[PDB]
């Protein structure tokens, strides 16, 4: 397997619809040793779900908390000597930030929270996982969406936060590359997951993507997963600071009839 | 003048080096009626400074505060019936966020403050100014920097914030366009202003820019000012969501002939 | 006027719908002295059309020909001492390159021709105008389209050539800036012009743009021309190698 | 192997330094069946070189000629039923297009030849290979360089041609995606190959890349190769019209040489 032996932490596994789940499947298939995090309440949900991947640890981490992030690495450090990759696959903004008119809906706090959890958290993982990742061709991969590059209806404050996320990825790539750590992002097409169920007309966004995309289909979690897997391998050691669109070609078209 | 009659609010005037000063010079020249904001302490500084532009109003506005922003438009609405443009020319991040290695230096609270003041504040001005700006070919312009697009040494957290500012500009363009309001940013090349005095090797950044840029020079506040003024005119009514680099061509090269 | 005194050559004026016409209107309004070029056949058409701008010269220039380009500058140099700006507003690709599936339709010669006229020509005006333009804060502006950045239906080979154009604008900015010449491009939203009449469903592209754009309207030749004018002014001396979208915000949205 | 069974055509193999060599190494290691093209004179060179990959075919194809391109697929179709991938790794401009001031050096013919060979040829392979590639998750990958996006010294006419190649890639992706064919590009950092030996100060460009990149190193042919390999696998079926930078992060920084 092209991740044989590599020790990789996956955040954001929540259901078997989660992009994290596709990432997990793809890495397990490639011989990685996996560890997972969960937010307070979902301890049991998550342990059950990822038991099939034979996890070396399953640990709490609510990225709102500097402490928990700190502890994540202390505990993980008891199990592993180094860390080969961190997969950041978490996002959040309050419900009210995410439909209707951007300017009517945006609030100071809701803007703040979305950035805190969806963007700052990536640098915070990087900050705390740094020393475990020094000098072993390590990797980080964040999950992002095209609403970072373009104004879309509904995505709103998450679009602005994903923008922050992508800038963070690049500043992080620059800051960690002296330690040999590569840092990249995968910009997924829309996928029906738990996060998606907040959005009332999601099936239509999906249909529009499949219609307008060059490949005339929707992406699935394995396509994304496999891509994240690859970006955590020795094969990608020439790639950093990069956004790879895994979106059936959506990003490259304009005006699909 | 091509801004004659237009009622424009300018934020971020702080010294005669400020980009906002260049913006003010250019708009006054072009016949705009001007109003300025200041942050608490600097009331006297700013009134003295912008007196030469015969301002219709010089009002407090610390964009940390939702209230003050709200009152800004209340007070301004007493003086003016509509508003034609808002020029956003404010940034801030804590000193610690701005040199050395990004990951060593970045903190949760510093990330937060940088975004709050540098990025969210744009949408907040839009949110509160919106009604005064309805259906008169109104305009918004934010100042940005190429550290939004690329990782640069030092810029760090401000880079991330600037990326957020630029997204905000686009989402605001989409949200306000039905009211005929155009929303854009100017991306200035580096210029020696008060904000620049925080950065310890700035003269060298300036010198590098001038060497590497196709135009072999550094931009000044009039080049920026004039561009901002343009983007607030009836001549730019086809332009929105856009970032216009005013940087002597810096953005379009890589690796000059001197390595 | 903010172009008062400036001596500017405008290419591509063909009808009063032409983007060049909007550019001409705007620069005349701003006090520029104008000169125009035309392709062989349209001499009378064009002379009539631009007479209202009181042109210093109206001269043939088919950018397929290196010699005609050369002679354009010889003749112009007999009228003016220096040249303040060149406005490039010309494109062309054979009809067959421009609808249906890109791969079906693209041909070696059609690819070639589209790039020759649509892109190479920009550097060729630069090459030959350069010495008239040295050290007077001169300018060049090309017209481009978002079909350069994204794959669109129909635009095909012209999109590829637009992308080549845009690069030629950047390499030109880099090559000419030591002489103080600024080089930029204005990326226009779609406008119903003679070039547009080649495209069978154009009214629908227009309607889509107006629907999907943040400003909910179509741009016109005055919005484009005003921007071209500005990019030829002393006000814009900090700007080069830039693409300015004049498209009612279309470039910045996705899925609307 | 993640390309086991896949039938892939590789253009541009010229020496064991070629980027095509690294791509070939990678894909053979992943179980691909390989075929190679060469330009007239280099038949023996290339047969010797790629013998270690056990090629199903080694065929002439000068992309100046529509006939040779056509015949490449006729011959290849005698050996294989379908084709899984085409790797386009070929560029050329005449010597005189490639150093000095862009505008002094660009010529009508040189511009033409650069685009014909470096850009049009990709769509030409697509055109003729399309029928062998229908409905099997097939792939195309072109090699490109950041000189397409930015103006750089020396690259000149090739930069404009690369810009054209990247648009061709996007329009090809949109035109072939109804047949399930994905089409992408890899934007390599500079690598010392035969094409590089035309450029007189190449070692310095390399050294500058390494200094300014986040990863503080030069990419090699395997890094590029492996990425190309991946873009031709089933794992990459959600990726098209993309440019992947395999350049040790060069593309995302600015002013990395200012201390
Ligand atoms: N769903 C789509 O269409 C789509 C498209 C592009 C990108 N994405 C992104 O992919 C990522 C994974 O999301 P998904 O689609 O698999 O949805 P999901 O709802 O399964 O995952 C969202 C994750 O964020 C986690 N989370 C929320 N707050 C957290 C916190 N404070 N600390 C730690 N974890 C927290 C949740 O537990 C969950 O695992 C997100 O970054 C999302 O932006 C989704
Ligand atoms: N100076 C440069 O090189 C450069 C380059 C690119 C972009 N810009 C942008 O131009 C803008 C103006 O910057 P400058 O360069 O003139 O520096 P400046 O110091 O004169 O402007 C900074 C301004 O920010 C204001 N400010 C800070 N926190 C504030 C708050 N909480 N509420 C209200 N106002 C606040 C100050 O009053 C001041 O007027 C900034 O957006 C800056 O990022 C500057
Ligand atoms: N029409 C749109 O919707 C639109 C949108 C974006 C960009 N543009 C660009 O704006 C420019 C102006 O054209 P327009 O749309 O106003 O249409 P137009 O038909 O008025 O302009 C076409 C011009 O190109 C000239 N031309 C063609 N072959 C030529 C040659 N060999 N030598 C010299 N001149 C030649 C013709 O004389 C004509 O004036 C073009 O480059 C076009 O690509 C148009
Ligand atoms: N070398 C770099 O630093 C670098 C960086 C980015 C991209 N690239 C690209 O990668 C590809 C490979 O370059 P390389 O460095 O391996 O060089 P190389 O010289 O080893 O290979 C270049 C190839 O183009 C082929 N070629 C030239 N004219 C041809 C024609 N008319 N018909 C068919 N084939 C022809 C040559 O035979 C040769 O195989 C090129 O597209 C190049 O621009 C190279
Ligand atoms: C917080 C959050 C993050 C997400 N990351 C991806 N998605 C899925 C999505 C795709 C397309 C659109 Cl237009 C929208 Cl609105 C949502 C998320 C949804 C939520 C609610
Ligand atoms: C808060 C703040 C915002 C700014 N926006 C632009 N500048 C000037 C600058 C330009 C380039 C670089 Cl690399 C740096 Cl570090 C600073 C700012 C400086 C400060 C202190
Ligand atoms: C040769 C030529 C060049 C052009 N440059 C722009 N246009 C018009 C146009 C605008 C929008 C769209 Cl979507 C399309 Cl397909 C065409 C051109 C038309 C022709 C015929
Ligand atoms: C035809 C051709 C294509 C190429 N694509 C890349 N290179 C090598 C190279 C890499 C970086 C730089 Cl800045 C330069 Cl100038 C050259 C090529 C060289 C040739 C001769």
Nearest-Cα residue of chain A relative to residue B64: A108
Question: Given ligand 8 and candidates D199, D207, D219, D250, which is best to mutate, with the most ligand atoms within 8 Å of its CB?
Answer: D199
Yes or no: say if D209 and D248 are a contact pair by the CB < 8 Å rule: yes
- Return the bridge partners of D9, or none: D35, D86
CATH assignment of the domain containing A30: 3.40.50.720
Q: For B47, phi and psi rounded to 5 degrees? A: -65, -45
Q: Which of A103, A120, A160 sits opposite B127 (nearest CB)?
A: A103
Tell how far CA D146 is from the center of its chain: 13
Is the shortest distance between the CB of D240 and ligand 4 below 6 Å? no
Yes or no: say if D208 and D152 are a contact pair by the CB < 8 Å rule: no
Cβ distance D104 to C175 less than 8 Å, yes or no, reads yes
Of the candidates C206, C197, C187, C195, the residue with the CA atom closest to the CA atom of residue C145 = C187
Check the annotation: does D3 bind a ligand: no
In order of A98, D22, D24, D141, D144, the CA distances from D225 in angstroms are 42, 5, 7, 11, 13
Residue D198 CA to residue D51 CA, distance in Å, equals: 27
The catalytic residue among B145, B171, B208, B250 is B145
Nearest-Cα residue of chain C relative to residue D150: C170
- Pick the atom of ligand 7 nearest to C93's CA: 1
Q: Which ligand is nearest to the CA of B255?
A: 8
Residues with CB under 6 A from ligand 2: B 12-15, 18-20, 39, 62-64, 89-92, 117, 143-145, 188, 190-191, 193-196
Q: How many CB atoms neighbour CB B3 within 10 A?
A: 24
Residue C52 CA to residue C60 CA, distance in Å, equals: 19
Nearest-Cα residue of chain C relative to residue A147: C254
D48's CB contacts (< 8 A; 6+ apart) are none
Chain B residues in contact with C216 (beta carbon < 8 A): 177-178
Check the annotation: does D93 bind a ligand: yes
Q: How many CB atoms neighbour CB D203 within 10 A?
A: 11
Quick check: is D145 catalytic? yes
What single string gives the DSSP state of each residue in B148-182? GTSB-TTTTHHHHHHHHHHHHHHHHHHHHGGGT-E
Number of helical (H) and strand (E) elements in chain A, helices listed first: 9, 7
DSSP 8-state assignment for residue B120: I
Residue C150 CA to residue A249 CA, distance in Å, equals: 11
SS3 A255: coil
Residue B143 CA to residue C7 CA, distance in Å, equals: 32
Q: In what order do the strands lie in the sheet with B85-88?
A: B57-60, B33-38, B7-10, B85-88, B139-144, B182-188, B242-246
Radius of gyration of chain B (CA): 18
Q: How many CB atoms neighbour CB D228 within 10 A?
A: 32
Strand runs (DSSP E) across B11-114, as ranges? Answer: 33-38, 57-60, 85-88
Cβ distance D213 to A248 less than 8 Å, yes or no, reads no
Ligand 3 center–CA D55 separation, angstroms: 49
Of the candidates A244, A206, A230, A195, the residue with the CA atom closest to the CA atom of residue A17 = A195
Give the pairing type, strands C139-144 and C243-246.
Answer: unpaired
Give the pairing type, strands C57-60 and C85-88.
Answer: unpaired
First to last CA, chain B: 45
- Return the bridge partners of A139, or none: A85, A182
Check the annotation: does C12 bind a ligand: yes
Give chain D's contact residues with B (Cβ, < 8 Å).
146-147, 149-153, 204-205, 207-209, 212, 214, 252-259
Check the annotation: does B244 bind a ligand: no
Ligand 5 center–CA A195 separation, angstroms: 6
Yes or no: say if D249 and D23 are a contact pair by the CB < 8 Å rule: no
Two structure tokens written together for C45 = 């058409």
B195: left (phi over 0), alpha (psi -120 to 50) or beta: alpha
Quick check: is C155 catalytic? yes
Residue C161 CA to residue C76 CA, distance in Å, equals: 28
Ligand 4 center–CA C108 separation, angstroms: 20
The catalytic residue among B21, B38, B120, B155 is B155
Ligand 4 center–CA D89 separation, angstroms: 5
Chain A residues in contact with D246 (beta carbon < 8 A): 238-239
Residue B59 CA to residue B78 CA, distance in Å, equals: 12
Place of tokens 């070609």: A249
| E strand or H helix that includes residue B104 | helix B102-105
The catalytic residue among C21, C38, C155, C250 is C155
What domain range includes position A9?
1-257
Yes or no: say if D254 and B146 are a contact pair by the CB < 8 Å rule: yes
A76's CB contacts (< 8 A; 6+ apart) are A9, A35, A57, A59, A83, A132
Sign of torsion over alpha carbons D241, D91, D9, A237: negative
Place of tokens 């990425």: D227
Nearest protein CA to atom 15 of ligand 7, as residue: C155
Yes or no: say if A61 and A69 are a contact pair by the CB < 8 Å rule: yes
Q: Which of D204, D205, D253 sits opposite B150 (nearest CB)?
A: D253
Yes or no: say if B165 and B144 are a contact pair by the CB < 8 Å rule: yes
Check the annotation: does B248 bind a ligand: no
Two structure tokens written together for B137 = 């070919």
Cβ distance B240 to C180 less than 8 Å, yes or no, reads no
Q: How many CB atoms neighbour CB A131 within 10 A?
A: 12
Residue C21 CA to residue C28 CA, distance in Å, equals: 10
Ligand 5 center–CA A91 separation, angstroms: 9
Is the shortest distance between the CB of D206 and ligand 8 below 6 Å? no
| E strand or H helix that includes residue B202 | helix B202-212
Question: Given ligand 3 and candidates C19, C114, C156, C245, which is best to mutate, with the most ligand atoms within 8 Å of its CB?
Answer: C19
Check the annotation: does B34 bind a ligand: no
Measured between CA atoms, how close is B147 to chain D, in angstroms?
8
Yes or no: say if D2 and D78 are a contact pair by the CB < 8 Å rule: no
Yes or no: say if A156 and A102 are a contact pair by the CB < 8 Å rule: yes
Cβ distance C153 to A256 less than 8 Å, yes or no, reads yes
Yes or no: say if D32 and D6 are a contact pair by the CB < 8 Å rule: yes
Give chain A's contact residues with B (Cβ, < 8 Å).
66, 101-104, 106, 108, 111-112, 115-116, 119-120, 123-124, 126-127, 130, 148, 150-151, 153, 156, 159-164, 166-168, 170-176, 241
Two structure tokens written together for D138 = 């097939």
Over chain D, what HEC string results? CCCCCCEEEECCCCCCCCHHHHHHHHHHHCCCEEEEEECHHHHHHHHHHHHHHCCCEEEECCCCCHHHHHHHHHHHHHHCCCCCEEEECCCCCCHHHCCCCHHHHCCHHHHHHHHHHHHHHHHHHHHHHHHHHCCCCCEEEEEECHHHCCECCCCHHHHHHHHHHHHHHHHHHHHHHHHCCEEEEEEECCCCCCHHHHCCCHHHHHHHHHHHCCCCCCCCHHHHHHHHHHHCCHHHCCCCCCEEEECCCHHHECCCCCC
Residue C250 CA to residue B241 CA, distance in Å, equals: 8
Cβ distance A120 to B126 less than 8 Å, yes or no, reads no
Of the candidates A166, A147, A149, A167, the residue with the CA atom closest to the CA atom of residue A157 = A147
- Pick the atom of ligand 3 nearest to C42's CA: 37
Two structure tokens written together for B146 = 């190429």
Measured between CA atoms, how close is C241 to chain A, in angstroms?
21
Over A48-62, what HEC string results? HHCHHHCCCEEEECC
Ligand 2 center–CA B192 separation, angstroms: 11
The method of structure determination was X-ray
Q: Where are the alpha helices (DSSP H) in chain C?
A: 19-29, 43-50, 66-79, 102-105, 108-115, 121-133, 156-176, 202-212, 221-230
Q: How many CB atoms neighbour CB B194 within 10 A?
A: 10
Burial of D247 per CB tally in 10 Å (0-12, 13-18, 19+): buried
D100: left (phi over 0), alpha (psi -120 to 50) or beta: left
- Pick the atom of ligand 8 nearest to D98's CA: 15
Measured between CA atoms, how close is C82 to chain D, in angstroms?
19
Ligand 5 center–CA B169 separation, angstroms: 20
Radius of gyration of chain C (CA): 17
Of the candidates C130, C129, C115, the residue with the CA atom closest to the CA atom of residue C168 = C115
Provide the domain count of chain C: 1
Check the annotation: does C104 bind a ligand: no
Q: Which ligand is nearest to the CA of A97?
A: 5
Q: How many CB atoms neighbour CB A4 within 10 A?
A: 10
What single string gives the DSSP state of each residue in C87-115? EE------GGGSSS-HHHH--HHHHHHHH
Nearest-Cα residue of chain A relative to residue B112: A112
Q: Where are the alpha helices (DSSP H) in chain A?
A: 19-29, 43-49, 66-79, 102-105, 108-115, 121-133, 156-176, 202-212, 221-231
Of the candidates A39, A123, A129, A128, the residue with the CA atom closest to the CA atom of residue A85 = A129
What single string gives the DSSP state of each residue in B140-156? EEEEE-GGGTSB-TTTT
Yes or no: say if C153 and A255 are a contact pair by the CB < 8 Å rule: yes
Residue A31 CA to residue B1 CA, distance in Å, equals: 69
B124's CB contacts (< 8 A; 6+ apart) are A108, B63, B66, B69
Tell how far CA D81 is from the center of its chain: 24
Q: For A187, phi and psi rounded to 5 degrees? A: -105, 100
Q: How many CB atoms neighbour CB B206 within 10 A?
A: 16
Place of tokens 């007070």: B75
Two structure tokens written together for C64 = 């397929």
Residue D153 CA to residue D204 CA, distance in Å, equals: 12
Cβ distance B174 to C239 less than 8 Å, yes or no, reads no
Number of helical (H) and strand (E) elements in chain C, helices listed first: 9, 7
Chain B residues in contact with D259 (beta carbon < 8 A): 153, 201, 204
Chain A residues in contact with B170 (beta carbon < 8 A): 150-151, 159
The dihedral formed by the CA atoms of C187, C189, C193 and C195, expressed in degrees to the nearest 10:
60
Two structure tokens written together for B104 = 């060593």
SS3 A139: strand
Q: How many CB atoms neighbour CB B195 within 10 A?
A: 18
Chain C residues in contact with B238 (beta carbon < 8 A): 189, 215, 219-220, 223-224, 227, 246-248
Q: How many CB atoms neighbour CB D4 within 10 A?
A: 10
First to last CA, chain C: 39
């Amino acid at each position: 397997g092209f991740l044989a032996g590599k020790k990789i932490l996956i955040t954001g596994l929540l259901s078997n619809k989660s992009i994290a789940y596709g990432i997990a499947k793809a890495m397990h298939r490639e011989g990685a040793e996996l560890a997972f995090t969960y937010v307070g309440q979902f301890k049991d949900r998550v342990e059950k779900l990822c038991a099939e991947f034979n996890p070396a640890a399953v640990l709490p981490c609510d990225v709102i908390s500097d402490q928990e992030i700190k502890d994540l690495f202390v505990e993980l450090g008891k199990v592993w000597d180094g860390l080969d990759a961190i997969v950041h696959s978490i996002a959040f903004a309050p419900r009210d930030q995410l439909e209707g008119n951007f300017i009517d809906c945006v609030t100071r706090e809701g803007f703040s929270i979305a950035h805190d959890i969806s963007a700052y958290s990536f640098a915070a993982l990087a900050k705390e996982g740094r020393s475990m990742m020094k000098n072993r061709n390590a990797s980080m991969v964040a999950l992002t969406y095209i609403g970072a590059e373009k104004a879309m209806p509904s995505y709103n404050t998450m679009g602005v936060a994903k923008a922050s996320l992508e800038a963070t990825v690049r500043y992080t790539a620059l800051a960690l590359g002296e330690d040999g750590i590569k840092v990249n992002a995968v910009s997924a097409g829309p996928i029906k997951t738990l996060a998606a169920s907040g959005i009332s007309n999601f099936k239509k966004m999906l249909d529009y993507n499949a219609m307008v995309s060059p490949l005339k289909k929707n992406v699935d979690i394995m396509e994304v997963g496999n891509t994240v897997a690859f970006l955590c391998s020795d094969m990608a050691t020439g790639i950093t600071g990069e956004v790879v669109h895994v979106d059936a070609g959506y990003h490259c078209v304009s005006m699909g009839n």
